[PDB]
Amino acid sequence: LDPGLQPGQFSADEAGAQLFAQSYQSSAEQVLFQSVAASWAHDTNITAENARRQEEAALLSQEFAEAWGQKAKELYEPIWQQFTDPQLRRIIGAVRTLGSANLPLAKRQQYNALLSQMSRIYSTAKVCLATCWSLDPDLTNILASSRSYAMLLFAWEGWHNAAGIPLKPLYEDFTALSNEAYKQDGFTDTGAYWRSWYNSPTFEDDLEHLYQQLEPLYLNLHAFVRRALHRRYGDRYINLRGPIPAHLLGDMWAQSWENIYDMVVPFPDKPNLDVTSTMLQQGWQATHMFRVAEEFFTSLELSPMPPEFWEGSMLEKPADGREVVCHASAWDFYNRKDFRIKQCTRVTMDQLSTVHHEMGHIQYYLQYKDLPVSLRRGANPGFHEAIGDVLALSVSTPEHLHKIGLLDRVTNDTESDINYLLKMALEKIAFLPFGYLVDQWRWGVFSGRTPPSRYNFDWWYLRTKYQGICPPVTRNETHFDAGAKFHVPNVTPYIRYFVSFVLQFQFHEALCKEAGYEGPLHQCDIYRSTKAGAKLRKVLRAGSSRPWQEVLKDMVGLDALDAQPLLKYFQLVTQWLQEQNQQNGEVLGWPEYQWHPPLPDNYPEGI
Amino acid sequence: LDPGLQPGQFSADEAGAQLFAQSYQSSAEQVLFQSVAASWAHDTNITAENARRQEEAALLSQEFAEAWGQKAKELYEPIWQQFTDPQLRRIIGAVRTLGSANLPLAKRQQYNALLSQMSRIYSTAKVCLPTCWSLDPDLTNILASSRSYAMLLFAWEGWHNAAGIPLKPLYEDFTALSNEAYKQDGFTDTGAYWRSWYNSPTFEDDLEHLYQQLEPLYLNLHAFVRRALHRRYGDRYINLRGPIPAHLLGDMWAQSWENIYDMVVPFPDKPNLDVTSTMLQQGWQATHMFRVAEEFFTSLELSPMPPEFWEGSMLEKPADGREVVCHASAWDFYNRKDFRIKQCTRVTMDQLSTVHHEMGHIQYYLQYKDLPVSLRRGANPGFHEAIGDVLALSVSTPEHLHKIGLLDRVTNDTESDINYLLKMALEKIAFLPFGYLVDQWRWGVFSGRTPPSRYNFDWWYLRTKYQGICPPVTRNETHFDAGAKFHVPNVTPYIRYFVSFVLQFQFHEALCKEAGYEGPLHQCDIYRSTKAGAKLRKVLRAGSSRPWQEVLKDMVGLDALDAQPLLKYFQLVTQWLQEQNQQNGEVLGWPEYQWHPPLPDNYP
Numbered sequence A: 001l002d003p004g005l006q007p008g009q010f011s012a013d014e015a016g017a018q019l020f021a022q023s024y025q026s027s028a029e030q031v032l033f034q035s036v037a038a039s040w041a042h043d044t045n046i047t048a049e050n051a052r053r054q055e056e057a058a059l060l061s062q063e064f065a066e067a068w069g070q071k072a073k074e075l076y077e078p079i080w081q082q083f084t085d086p087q088l089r090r091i092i093g094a095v096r097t098l099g100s101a102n103l104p105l106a107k108r109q110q111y112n113a114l115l116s117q118m119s120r121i122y123s124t125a126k127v128c129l130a131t132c133w134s135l136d137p138d139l140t141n142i143l144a145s146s147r148s149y150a151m152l153l154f155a156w157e158g159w160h161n162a163a164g165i166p167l168k169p170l171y172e173d174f175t176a177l178s179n180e181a182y183k184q185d186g187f188t189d190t191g192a193y194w195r196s197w198y199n200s201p202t203f204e205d206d207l208e209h210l211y212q213q214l215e216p217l218y219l220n221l222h223a224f225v226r227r228a229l230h231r232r233y234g235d236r237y238i239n240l241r242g243p244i245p246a247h248l249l250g251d252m253w254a255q256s257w258e259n260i261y262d263m264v265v266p267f268p269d270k271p272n273l274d275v276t277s278t279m280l281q282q283g284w285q286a287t288h289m290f291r292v293a294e295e296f297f298t299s300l301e302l303s304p305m306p307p308e309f310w311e312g313s314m315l316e317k318p319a320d321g322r323e324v325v326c327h328a329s330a331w332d333f334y335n336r337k338d339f340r341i342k343q344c345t346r347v348t349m350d351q352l353s354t355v356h357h358e359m360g361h362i363q364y365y366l367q368y369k370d371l372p373v374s375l376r377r378g379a380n381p382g383f384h385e386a387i388g389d390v391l392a393l394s395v396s397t398p399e400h401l402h403k404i405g406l407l408d409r410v411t412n413d414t415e416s417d418i419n420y421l422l423k424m425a426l427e428k429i430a431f432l433p434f435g436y437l438v439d440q441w442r443w444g445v446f447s448g449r450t451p452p453s454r455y456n457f458d459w460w461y462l463r464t465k466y467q468g469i470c471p472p473v474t475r476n477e478t479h480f481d482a483g484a485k486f487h488v489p490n491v492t493p494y495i496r497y498f499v500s501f502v503l504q505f506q507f508h509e510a511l512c513k514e515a516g517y518e519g520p521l522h523q524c525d526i527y528r529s530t531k532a533g534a535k536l537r538k539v540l541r542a543g544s545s546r547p548w549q550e551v552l553k554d555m556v557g558l559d560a561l562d563a564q565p566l567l568k569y570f571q572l573v574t575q576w577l578q579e580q581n582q583q584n585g586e587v588l589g590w591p592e593y594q595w596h597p598p599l600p601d602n603y604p605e606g607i
Numbered sequence B: 001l002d003p004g005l006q007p008g009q010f011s012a013d014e015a016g017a018q019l020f021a022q023s024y025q026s027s028a029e030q031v032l033f034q035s036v037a038a039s040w041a042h043d044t045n046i047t048a049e050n051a052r053r054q055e056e057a058a059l060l061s062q063e064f065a066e067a068w069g070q071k072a073k074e075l076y077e078p079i080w081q082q083f084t085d086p087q088l089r090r091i092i093g094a095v096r097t098l099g100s101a102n103l104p105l106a107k108r109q110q111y112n113a114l115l116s117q118m119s120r121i122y123s124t125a126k127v128c129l130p131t132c133w134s135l136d137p138d139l140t141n142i143l144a145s146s147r148s149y150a151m152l153l154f155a156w157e158g159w160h161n162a163a164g165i166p167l168k169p170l171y172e173d174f175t176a177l178s179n180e181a182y183k184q185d186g187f188t189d190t191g192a193y194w195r196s197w198y199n200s201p202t203f204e205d206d207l208e209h210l211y212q213q214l215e216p217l218y219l220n221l222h223a224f225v226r227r228a229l230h231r232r233y234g235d236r237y238i239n240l241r242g243p244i245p246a247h248l249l250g251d252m253w254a255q256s257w258e259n260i261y262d263m264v265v266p267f268p269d270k271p272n273l274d275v276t277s278t279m280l281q282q283g284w285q286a287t288h289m290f291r292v293a294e295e296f297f298t299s300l301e302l303s304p305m306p307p308e309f310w311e312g313s314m315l316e317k318p319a320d321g322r323e324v325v326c327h328a329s330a331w332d333f334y335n336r337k338d339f340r341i342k343q344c345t346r347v348t349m350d351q352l353s354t355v356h357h358e359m360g361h362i363q364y365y366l367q368y369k370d371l372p373v374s375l376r377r378g379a380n381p382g383f384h385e386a387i388g389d390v391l392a393l394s395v396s397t398p399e400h401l402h403k404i405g406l407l408d409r410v411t412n413d414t415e416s417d418i419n420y421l422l423k424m425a426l427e428k429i430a431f432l433p434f435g436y437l438v439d440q441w442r443w444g445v446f447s448g449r450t451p452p453s454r455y456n457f458d459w460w461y462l463r464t465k466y467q468g469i470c471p472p473v474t475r476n477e478t479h480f481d482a483g484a485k486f487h488v489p490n491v492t493p494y495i496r497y498f499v500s501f502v503l504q505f506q507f508h509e510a511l512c513k514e515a516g517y518e519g520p521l522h523q524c525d526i527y528r529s530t531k532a533g534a535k536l537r538k539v540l541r542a543g544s545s546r547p548w549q550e551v552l553k554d555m556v557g558l559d560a561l562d563a564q565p566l567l568k569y570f571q572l573v574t575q576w577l578q579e580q581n582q583q584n585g586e587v588l589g590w591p592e593y594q595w596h597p598p599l600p601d602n603y604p
């Protein structure tokens, strides 16, 4: 560790802890920058050399965390919990948790190399027929636009096999090292550490109670969609009393169903709410999508994207043959100047929403860039994930799409409302079981309830239990289907997205009220509301300086996650789907839980 | 409720609570008897009228528990936790727990009535062909001795459909009413009350730690047995890397595997350690089996069965066209006089072990009959289930079988040691996953984690997770396969049996040491050891007066459940099974977790 980065001496008291944090800040920024920079160089340009540099930067960060971490524990171990400065205790608590820096050097290197290798495997995996398809864009477009049961099966099986199988031995080793590291910080396992970020003793119970309120909406959406799939694929491939085959919902993970809207839209005579075709016809490109997102932010009197963002960001998949991490992400370099998005942007309506989601991260970074580095995070991780989604809820309204030239015809009638709320349900309600189950799986792995011998057995138990889907080909424990989802090998927690999908409707309700809007919640558009902007800004500028329950109370008037705003938003389609399913004699659920579809005749040769 | 059973006036202090407890347990003695008496009349003669009277008795019991529980909180609710007397603290907290008495009257009627109907459905269900077969003895005998895949399937599917499907709507109603009752006592759900019996903050974690030490033994036994089934039935019906079809292990629930011993016995040249054929050749009957078990108890200077036991017990299935609950059980009438067994006894070796198990209960009853009622229980429920099994461990040794004329003396060689420990593994190790998982299922139902919409989904998840078996025909949520196991509709907790199967080896080691034995633990016979009997008598007389942790430490030197004795008992066959599986290149476990066998051609 360079001497400029090493901790000096401080009194064993709060006024030294305060200078401890200021000195830490000075050094942490440099260490965070070199770490983020090395990660950027690798993720935009996957090479063995760039992985080596990233691993050395990770080792430097561990060295730093150990020195300041053990200094913080040498002096302030019994006094940091009683400091009068609230932000200072949050700063100290972060610095003192060592994580992977608890591992001996040899195990730190093993851990860093596992992360790099898992990232390379996921983001360079390919499905081959000579020619070979990548996940983004090749397989993504197949899952989204093909309606050939056999072609979709080929992409689904090929992807899950290519990505999952080689990751499994690495993921087992990572899990053991991660647990070893956080056990030295006092946590029973890594999942307990991840859950502690929400500072709620009843977190898991709170989430289950939320999901109990939301599940009836999912069950009815599921039964309605299953019926539409049955009319296209037939009784051989769709069981009206069984799980839906996991490759038929428009998405590799069946996590968002927006791409099958054309098959489920109840009133096709109304305006076409999937504006992808109009974007193509009009010649939209990636940079236009980002400029339109930015202008919504500035319409609220939030910050534009700085020059450093436009000069440094990767907004399209490189055409020079480089391998890149294509999963969309937003980057804070912790120098208060450099902020970037990395996205292999495609010209579609759902990608326009993803652009807003990522730019919402950037807006957060810009608003809290002047806080201490330890407080440059969301009030909780679900806050960070919800910011851009909240704006995108306004952007997706038919009225707003008309304003930006993507929907010529504009209607206000009950059929058009049902169409729109059904499309939004395919995006927001269909995701809820998946956003809930992923970390239930990983929590069980981290705790040891799910050993390697049950990785896939327990994954598919949860997939069927919550999503009501089944794998379209047989799987066994050689397969590692959880590994075929970006966040698992890239070790990004997932429960934040279930929290986000609830929270964003709480935010939307509050911002719409602040904007003076007095119509139906799902027709609200906060575009150009500077009052809504100022309320959102107060949240963003707080970072993690205050408990999220208090930040939420100031914003929405409640100190807890609450499903009622989401339920209110969807109320009309919730009632309509329930009526439709009853009239059609649907079975809610999948009581034939053991059913799987047969294989296509002449599979996989027809491909 | 009779005035003489309603509670009197008592001071609000520990001295008054001492008189309170005495007056409670003198009046409880009379109420319990009339409940047990009416249950007995029903289970040995299932009719609507005996159901009516058993329910009248249950309502009266709930009236009694109400009156005395409400008085107990009225007087002592804020002070009893501070009594110096630990036994009195035990009694009062119990009396303060009302259970189904917390229900309003109309719900009490409904709850009492669901129990009667679930019991009738399970014990009268039949499988009819294309004559009708009953579970005991007909289907039991088919599962134990048929080696026809299709016949075993017909019996397995027939039974699970006939019992499970009609029970499901009733079990849902029962679950809801049971949870409503015990929430009023402060339990999050009925499962939490059941678990509270073990007075351990870390019960579930401790069980999981026990199972982690036992699972390698089960996995090796499983893979060895799967290989033997593959040879018999073929690659069509057995997947060497997948779960075993659930009907092929000699038992309707695949819960113990001793009945396929003759298919997996490695050294069939050696003496047949299944002495069933000798029992029949010699003319054994139910009454002989009970007299032989009795004499083991008295050989230890424990009590004989009293005249009331022999006159009142039902030791054979009645042949007078009558319907009975055939599941074996042992009855305490809480009058210090009447103790009985109800068993549809068959002349087989595993039934001789079941006879000892049931007589274990009776011996317990006899040794604590003078205690005040609230203590007339095992230190915990697993203690009660373990007593007879411990003696049966001695009875099953080839040396003891030789003493009682059921085995021509065998040689103390290695092939006979392996043969024996394998047969015992089929009976004891194979049970461990099942004993563990049944109440995992039931706890999730009570907690709400498992709604009716996932009863069968979650049952088969657990059956595959723990036992590594699969249903031999497709199942869906119309089926209620948990309902096809006696203890579910008859609402008898199951974790006691996992506890018992670990505890009995701790008891066995303690008693063998106390007897002076010094050979291998699995060759010990405590027959006629009056010192062993004396140390066991102490446990039985303690009832539930002292915490089971203290009773246990007095007997075995340790205050907690421990798998080491079980591991020591089986050590030699654990090593041998490991070697056999490596030689055959077995995969341990069932990584093809999705696999199910195909149907037989033109079945049924």
Ligand SMILES: *[C@@H]1O[C@H](CO[C@@H]2O[C@@H](C)[C@@H](O)[C@@H](O)[C@@H]2O)[C@@H](O[C@@H]2O[C@H](CO)[C@@H](O[C@@H]3O[C@H](CO)[C@@H](O)[C@H](O)[C@@H]3O)[C@H](O)[C@H]2NC(C)=O)[C@H](O)[C@H]1NC(C)=O
Residues within 6 Å of the ligand: A399, A412, A518, A519, A520, A523
């Ligand atoms: C689409 O249309 C709906 C429905 O409009 C209402 O019903 C129609 C059948 C006609 O009768 C319309 O004249 C009628 O407004 C619109 O929702 C409605 O918006 C208005 C605001 O413009 C709401 O009125 C307000 O209501 C509150 C009480 O909550 C008062 O405090 C306000 O002063 C004001 O009167 C009205 O409640 C609301 N109706 C419903 C059912 O939500 C909607 O605005 C419109 N959308 C677009 C994009 O044009």
Ligand SMILES: O=C(NCC(=O)N1[C@@H](c2cccc(O)c2)CC[C@H]1C(=O)O)[C@@H](S)Cc1ccc(O)cc1
Residues within 6 Å of the ligand: A327, A328, A329, A330, A353, A354, A357, A358, A361, A388, A389, A392, A490, A492, A497
């Ligand atoms: O979350 C991230 N993008 C979005 C995203 O992935 N999702 C969320 C979504 C997707 C699209 C539109 C939305 O309105 C929201 C929900 C689903 C979930 C999903 O797609 O699975 C990056 S910012 C997080 C990261 C990535 C790499 C890292 O190394 C570190 C962090």
Ligand SMILES: O=C(NCC(=O)N1[C@@H](c2cccc(O)c2)CC[C@H]1C(=O)O)[C@@H](S)Cc1ccc(O)cc1
Residues within 6 Å of the ligand: B327, B328, B329, B330, B353, B354, B357, B358, B361, B385, B389, B392, B490, B492, B497
């Ligand atoms: O346990 C009881 N018999 C034995 C028994 O069932 N088993 C235990 C066993 C079976 C055979 C031999 C043994 O060494 C032990 C373990 C499995 C388990 C099983 O067979 O599933 C009555 S005492 C239980 C009851 C009956 C009716 C009631 O109303 C209340 C309780």
Ligand SMILES: *[C@@H]1O[C@H](CO)[C@@H](O[C@@H]2O[C@H](CO)[C@@H](O)[C@H](O)[C@H]2NC(C)=O)[C@H](O)[C@H]1NC(C)=O
Residues within 6 Å of the ligand: A045, A047, A048, A049, A050
């Ligand atoms: C991707 O990373 C590689 C390194 O892995 C870069 O290759 C270097 O390119 C520079 C040019 O600036 C050369 O001087 C070095 O010799 C190269 N190093 C190696 C090891 O080949 C490459 O430039 C990067 N690509 C992009 C577009 O940034």
Ligand SMILES: *[C@@H]1O[C@H](CO)[C@@H](O[C@@H]2O[C@H](CO)[C@@H](O)[C@H](O)[C@H]2NC(C)=O)[C@H](O)[C@H]1NC(C)=O
Residues within 6 Å of the ligand: B399, B412, B518, B519, B520, B523
């Ligand atoms: C069967 O033989 C074994 C040894 O082959 C006997 O075990 C020995 O028992 C004596 C005491 O009787 C001990 O001193 C030895 O240490 C034991 N040896 C082993 C290897 O355990 C066993 O007692 C014999 N049992 C019978 C019933 O004959």
Ligand SMILES: *[C@@H]1O[C@H](CO[C@@H]2O[C@@H](C)[C@@H](O)[C@@H](O)[C@@H]2O)[C@@H](O)[C@H](O)[C@H]1NC(C)=O
Residues within 6 Å of the ligand: A241, A591, A592, B473, B474, B475, B476, B477, B478
């Ligand atoms: C449940 O199962 C019943 C019994 O048949 C089983 O399911 C059918 C579909 C076949 O696969 C058969 O081999 C199985 O044994 C069916 O009658 C019933 O329709 C099934 N579905 C429901 C909702 O109960």
Ligand SMILES: *[C@@H]1O[C@H](CO)[C@@H](O)[C@H](O)[C@H]1NC(C)=O
Residues within 6 Å of the ligand: A474, A475, A476, A477, A478, B241, B591, B592
């Ligand atoms: C798992 O499935 C694959 C392909 O279906 C197969 O090659 C493999 O043998 C199966 N079993 C195991 C144990 O891997």
Ligand SMILES: *[C@@H]1O[C@H](CO)[C@@H](O)[C@H](O)[C@H]1NC(C)=O
Residues within 6 Å of the ligand: B045, B047, B049, B050
């Ligand atoms: C069985 O019960 C019925 C009605 O309860 C009664 O009439 C009959 O005598 C009983 N049979 C025996 C054998 O006790």
Ligand SMILES: [Cl-]
Residues within 6 Å of the ligand: A197, A381, A382, A493, A494, A495, A496
């Ligand atoms: Cl998170």
Ligand SMILES: [Cl-]
Residues within 6 Å of the ligand: B194, B197, B381, B382, B493, B494, B495, B496
């Ligand atoms: Cl129990």
Ligand SMILES: [Mg+2]
Residues within 6 Å of the ligand: A144, A258, A259, A276, A348, A349, A350
């Ligand atoms: Mg799309």
Ligand SMILES: [Mg+2]
Residues within 6 Å of the ligand: B250, B251, B256, B258, B259, B350
């Ligand atoms: Mg048996």
Ligand SMILES: [Zn+2]
Residues within 6 Å of the ligand: A357, A358, A361, A384, A385
């Ligand atoms: Zn994000």
Ligand SMILES: [Zn+2]
Residues within 6 Å of the ligand: B357, B358, B361, B384, B385
């Ligand atoms: Zn018993």
